[PDB]
RNA sequence: GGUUGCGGCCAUAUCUACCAGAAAGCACCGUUUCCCGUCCGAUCAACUGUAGUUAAGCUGGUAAGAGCCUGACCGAGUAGUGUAGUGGGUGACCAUACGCGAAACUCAGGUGCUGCAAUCU
RNA sequence: GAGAACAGAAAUCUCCAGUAGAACAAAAGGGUAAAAGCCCCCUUGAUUUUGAUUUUCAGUGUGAAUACAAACCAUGAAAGUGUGGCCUAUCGAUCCUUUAGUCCCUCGGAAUUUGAGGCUAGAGGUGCCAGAAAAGUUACCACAGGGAUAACUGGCUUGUGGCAGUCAAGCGUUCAUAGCGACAUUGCUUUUUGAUUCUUCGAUGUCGGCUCUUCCUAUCAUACCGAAGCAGAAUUCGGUAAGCGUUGGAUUGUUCACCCACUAAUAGGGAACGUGAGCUGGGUUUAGACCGUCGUGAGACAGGUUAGUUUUACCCUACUGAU
RNA sequence: GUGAUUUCUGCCCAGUGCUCUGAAUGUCAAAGUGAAGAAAUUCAACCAAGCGCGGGUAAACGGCGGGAGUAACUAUGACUCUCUUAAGGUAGCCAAAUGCCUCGUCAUCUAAUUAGUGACGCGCAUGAAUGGAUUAACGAGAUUCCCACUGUCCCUAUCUACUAUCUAGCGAAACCACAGCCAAGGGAACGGGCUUGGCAGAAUCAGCGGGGAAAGAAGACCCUGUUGAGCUUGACUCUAGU
RNA sequence: GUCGAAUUUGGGUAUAGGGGCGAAAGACUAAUCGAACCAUCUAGUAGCUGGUUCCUGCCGAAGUUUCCCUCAGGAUAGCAGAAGCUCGUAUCAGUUUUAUGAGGUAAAGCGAAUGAUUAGAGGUUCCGGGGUCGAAAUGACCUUGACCUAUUCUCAAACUUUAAAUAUGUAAGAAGUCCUUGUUACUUAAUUGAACGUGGACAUUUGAAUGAAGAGCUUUUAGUGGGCCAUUUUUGGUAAGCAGAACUGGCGAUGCGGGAUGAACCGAACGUAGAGUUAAGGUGCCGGAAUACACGCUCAUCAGACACCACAAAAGGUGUUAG
């Protein structure tokens, strides 16, 4: 393009040039989750996921590739049911170029990419236990692709997969989401039912 | 990039979180003071009560009290000498302060009669 | 207990949905002859003394529930920052020393409610 | 959610039940809900005199704005409020001239009027807005200074040029890597070019050639080797390698470029873009003179064309030699 | 003013200039006249030129357009439509000493041509006494060829005089912080002088053109300066003259 | 080149300075010409160059503020020096501490405002492009969009509730409270207060700390106004030994020891001397200092660089080392 040279940095706080710098040379990762999408929330489990260690610009078209040849492997050796690819980076900040032959010029935009915190989650996917090595030898391509970077760490949760959380879900056996407070249950937990539990329910409301 | 009197203030002289509107009608009644020390303290609802921007956060004493709403002056001074300059503003604007150790010169004194009495 | 003029914070200050309301007080409500008022229209405005009502309004309780709380515990001694080095690393950055030191997240007890003057059963 | 006849997405009309999402001339931000918005009612405070204040961290006048005093009004039933447009922008010294002011002050030998002059409050212009009244050209030219300031060397930097490199989707009919590689990504390079203004106008003379060494290797040829989609040959890729070579003529001032030939090859590249105290002077960049093209003129063209003064070495060093 | 002859003088008078008795009328100064005050003085009317109006004028300065359609494969314009300023380049003439792109395209001359020459034309931007096109002869004028000739050259070599050179006599100038050997470093970014390292022997001769960012004429190019001076108009400001 | 004709040339004569003469070049006019020569005005002018003369001793800077046809000057502040006043713990401070204010930037935040953006879910939802019993007000379901509704994904100089650190206002023990009354223009209806003042009780004071070579004050008149470095925080720019801001040091004005080498690095501030320790840096050898003492790691260029032209990435190793 021009090189990485309007690369990784700072140089400029952060011209996210929306309403203010109208001309933003428009994206080029309009893709983020590539893979076997509508998915089960069960099933495709344990999550491995690439984390980049360095506060840096991994710019617009780079993160392309990245989904490019993650797709490429993820389904070549695994299939449509297999991935599900995560963008999460994302690539605002507008940088610029310069072109009265040398007196006072700010930038035109050119090109978007995004700021890496040293420590964050980039393009990080998730699937079933039997996909291990399959994801992960597949997300090492992107580390070599990509301004490298890399954690292609292994995970667990919170529940953005399988996801430990592993003694969690795997307790949340009984329900999903609230729980919350107690009242109007209409996530059927079982079993009878309002009467018993809207006895126990205020049943201690009243014991204040 | 201009100079105007209000410049830069978008957040100064600011308003409110929710209060965003109408003078408690208590920081309108209190009385001054020929000599009680004033606190100024800018609030868009008014404007006179408004103090040229520098003054601002700034706290002095009542020199004037015209009270005809007219809140009091003070002055105050500034930088490489600090020739004090006495400001004119309104009574919705400025507020007490934390002269508030005369209830220890109180707490003193009398304490300390009560510590004649009983040395 | 209400009612009048109130202070307050005025979401640390309402919603929303159901109820329940003795006594008084306000309300709703009767009525157009005047004062007065309709971009039309006695609705509103105001103007005159009891036929009928608590149904609303209001008041308070229920949700725990939506709001902000108020506190504390993980969250958190982090995140960020004051100073320091002839510290680390190509670099990006980063660590350590003393010092300050959050916010979101959640767990709890609140619920809008105090209280001023004058009345009043 | 209701009622529609030119309406029927609606342009516009009337009913009803809840986020301040609207509106405040004009930019943007502040602000503003019985309002600071909108409909009505009544006025002219957008008033006189001052002064004080605030606004450059502010000691300078200006404009603007804040609170008073004294008057004189508006408006409300009032308490109030109103000294211009909710706040933050929207303006102007010095002589001169005009005007509004008491009907006040003097023309100096006294008067009278006419006129002139004064005092205080304004308009008339200064936009370079702290306020000169102002056309070009010089290539025939000139002066004082500027490395404070540009052409050139060097200098950083390397985007831009050039050159290698990773990943492997692809070509390569069968196969990703023999030979190549999209995307994406790491870099080296200082004979491009571009930035920059540090060095040198209080002396540095341009481009090209001619000559003459000397270095680099990112090797065109020659030496030995490794792979090939290597049968032979003929090619390609790569390693050790800078020892040694790397030509002659048209056309242009040419660098360059483009042919004609040759040969093993007819590689690239540094040394102040090597090389006038070493030519040459063709170009470039004085005065002379054509044209075109702009201009009224003078002249002016990074347009084309022609004619135009290249000074000095004995000294020091460096060398080739020499006592 | 233009430049022998020879031929050839296209069209534009609106613009700027020039210039005529001209225009039925509008400005237009001084004196002179009228009106008003008590005058000073301030209002008036008429008023030479000039101006403005009218005409001629280009061998006077100078000028000389632009876009749309538009059959009998195809591209095409004598066609018309147009909007348009005086007029809308006429004869003639070229990549020409004017042509931008351009090294124009085709020939031609070469083994070869950014040269030549001959052609061709919406020629950036040729053109008619701003003179247009020709043209015998003339030319220390510019170009390109051919023949002859030739050290220009391939490829250099040898010979003569004079000078270098060495002696006697005669005897200067330039220049000159102090000096004078290198390599890297840093340095006001090309040190002789400094740092580290190479090294490093008196005293001199002839040559030489790397270096002394060497030498003279306070640098031909640029800018700054409240610096000039020569030319120049429809810039100010005036003046001889008329 | 020309060489009998516009020939060549002597003498004599004529034209003299904005004037001459000129087959026109800006030519020539006594080596002088885009305005001769001589003298005088005249030491012309100079915001620019150059130099500016004898010692030591003290104090000791500016490049920045504002207004100028100022851009190299000048005014104006601010820095300095001198001269001195007035009187002696008054009170002073580039300082912390307690009490009390002021901040919206770091951070944080979008199942919160706004404005961006992921992704599917649920509508017992509406305007249409595909189908269906289908087919001209087809009821009814239907597939993509079209707005909810509880969710998901990631962002903001010129967005946001929340909101730091640093820095930034004040206050302090104490002239202070506490008590008594008295003055009239003030406004309260006034025994209403306001402002001022008399008489009266207690101060050395029982959180503030810490520092004082007093303190205050007046005149005057130099230089300066071209600044440059660094660390952090930043603006532009691929970048810069680039251009621009912000604190704090610093260089310019400065030596001294480290960094070989050098304005801004580190240590460290200079009267003249003796002795002693040390900073930073170093101790094989140049060169003072151990070829000291320990546990490992590294073997064709492996290296030996706190700030710097001081350089070196992505990628990869059955080298060897621990995990």
Known sequence: RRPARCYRYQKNKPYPKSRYNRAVPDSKIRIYDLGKKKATVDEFPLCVHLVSNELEQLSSEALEAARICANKYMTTVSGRDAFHLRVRVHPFHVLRINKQGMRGAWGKPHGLAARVDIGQIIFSVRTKDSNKDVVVEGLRRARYKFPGQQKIILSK???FTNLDRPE???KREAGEVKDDGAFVK????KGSLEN???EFPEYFAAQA | KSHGYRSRTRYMFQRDFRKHGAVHLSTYLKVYKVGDIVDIKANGSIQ???????????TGVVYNVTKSSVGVIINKMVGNRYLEKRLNLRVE????????QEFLERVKANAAKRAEAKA
């Open chain 1, 157 to 159: 949760k919170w529940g």
């Open chain 1, 168 to 170: 969690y879900l795997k």
């Open chain 1, 186 to 189: 209409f996530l059927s937990k």
């Open chain 1, 196 to 198: 018993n539990i809207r």
């Open chain 2, 48 to 58: 006179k009560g408004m103090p040229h921007k520098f003054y601002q956060g700034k």
């Open chain 2, 93 to 100: 604007h400025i507020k007490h302060s934390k002269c508030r």
